[PDB]
Design a protein around this ligand. Structure first.
Ligand code: ADP
Length: 303
């Protein structure tokens, strides 16, 4: 009975040694637990990431059809690792950032390092030597696609990446700076260097009695080298306001039973919150105490 597995692990064990950590996993393991991670503003996605947030030191890829949430998740990423001392750098190539928004989310823009490169090449160096300073915690490159090499501006892209990614995946691992890339093209590279790959797509248009409060987004963790992959999460994005914390709690809060649905009436053990997800949201919105409790308990029911 044991000889079988008693060898799988001897093997499986040397596999890690020779190649890494998450080289060979059990989609069922609760395994590991690092003390470095950046929340993403979605408890739903954090437990989905398996480590409660984006691993620091790794390269992260977040792709999906336009207007489905990538950058929103990224700005929060920033918001967090920034509220926690470290600073973030944003290498712009799309030229479509809205600070008033990045701000609401929680970014301290006035102290955010933005760079508007000219070549896709110049961009990866500014991003390279910048990460080497060992100062940035998180850096985000907006659009793996908008990174044209000098030639085209004056095949070579997926090389530009290949090149840059090797020379850059290195430092990152020393530096400890986690890096984010937004996609929709030069793939291959990133599709491998990535330690984590999030697939973000929009599932519904959040109706709010009126016409719309936001969008229900779904993320699928297609690649996870820091824990088991394939787990997925969904959350809401309120038009110009961001990933609804609270709303993320109702859902997580009932899919774990700390919140009961007695027929559209969300109740938190005994006492009611409201009637209609958006109403209970409201309750949670203006009730931080109770809120933090669910989060707290939700957070203790998992890790
Ligand atoms: N400045 C803004 N004002 C209002 N809503 C915004 C703003 N920026 C982003 N959003 C919301 O984010 C959604 C798309 O996410 P981002 O805008 O994250 O796109 P990606 O999904 O990054 O293209 C939009 O449909 C919208 O609901």
């Amino acid at each position: 009975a044991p000889d079988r597995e008693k060898a799988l692990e001897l093997a499986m064990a040397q596999i890690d040694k020779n190649f890494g950590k998450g080289s060979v996993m059990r989609l069922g393991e609760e395994v590991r637990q690092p003390i470095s991670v950046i929340p993403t503003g979605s408890i739903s996605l954090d437990v989905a990431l398996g480590i409660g947030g984006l691993p620091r030191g790794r390269v992260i890829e977040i792709y999906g059809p336009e207007s489905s949430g990538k950058t929103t998740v990224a700005l929060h990423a920033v918001a967090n690792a920034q509220a926690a001392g470290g600073i973030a750098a944003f290498i712009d190539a799309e030229h479509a950032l809205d600070p008033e928004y990045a701000k609401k989310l929680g970014v301290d823009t006035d102290s955010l390092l933005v760079s508007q490169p000219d070549t896709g090449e110049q961009a990866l160096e500014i991003a390279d030597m910048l990460v080497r300073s060992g100062a940035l915690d998180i850096i985000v490159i907006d659009s793996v696609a908008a990174l044209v090499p000098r030639a085209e501006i004056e095949g070579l892209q997926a090389r530009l990446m290949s090149q840059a990614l090797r020379k850059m995946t290195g430092a990152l691992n020393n530096s400890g700076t986690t890096a984010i890339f937004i996609n929709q093209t030069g793939g291959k590279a990133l599709k491998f260097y990535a330690s984590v790959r999030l697939d973000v797509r929009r599932i519904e248009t959040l109706k709010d009695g009126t016409d719309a409060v936001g969008n229900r987004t779904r993320v699928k963790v297609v690649k996870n080298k820091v824990s088991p992959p394939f787990k997925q999460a969904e959350f809401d994005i309120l038009y110009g306001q961001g990933i609804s914390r609270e709303g993320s709690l109702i859902d997580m809060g009932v899919e774990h039973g700390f919140i009961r649905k007695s027929g559209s009436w969300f109740t938190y053990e005994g006492e009611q919150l409201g009637q209609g997800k958006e109403n209970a949201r409201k309750f949670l919105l203006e009730n931080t105490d109770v809120a933090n409790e669910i989060e707290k308990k939700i957070k203790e029911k998992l890790g």
